[PDB]
Structure 1
Amino acid sequence: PIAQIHIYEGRSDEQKETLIREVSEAISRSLDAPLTSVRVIITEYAKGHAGIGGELASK
Structure 2
Amino acid sequence: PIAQIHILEGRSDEQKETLIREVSEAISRSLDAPLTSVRVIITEMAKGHFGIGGELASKV
Name the TM-score, length of structure 2 as normaliser: 0.97
- Counterparts of 1:10 and 1:47, CA distance in 2: 9
- The number of residue pairs the alignment matches comes to 59
Q: CA deviation at 1:29?
A: 0.3
Task: Structure 2: give runs of 5+ residues left out of the alignment.
Answer: none
- Counterparts of 1:51 and 1:19, CA distance in 2: 23
- Counterparts of 2:21 and 2:58, CA distance in 1: 28
- Cα RMSD after superposing both structures: 0.4
Task: Structure 1: give runs of 5+ residues left out of the alignment.
Answer: none
Sequence identity of aligned pairs in percent? 95
As a proportion of its length, which structure holds more helix?
A: 2
CA offsets, 1:17-54, max 9 Å, x none? Answer: 00000000000000000000000000000110000000
- Counterparts of 2:45 and 2:4, CA distance in 1: 13
Name the TM-score, length of structure 1 as normaliser: 0.98
Show the 5 A alignment for 1:1-59: 1-59=1-59
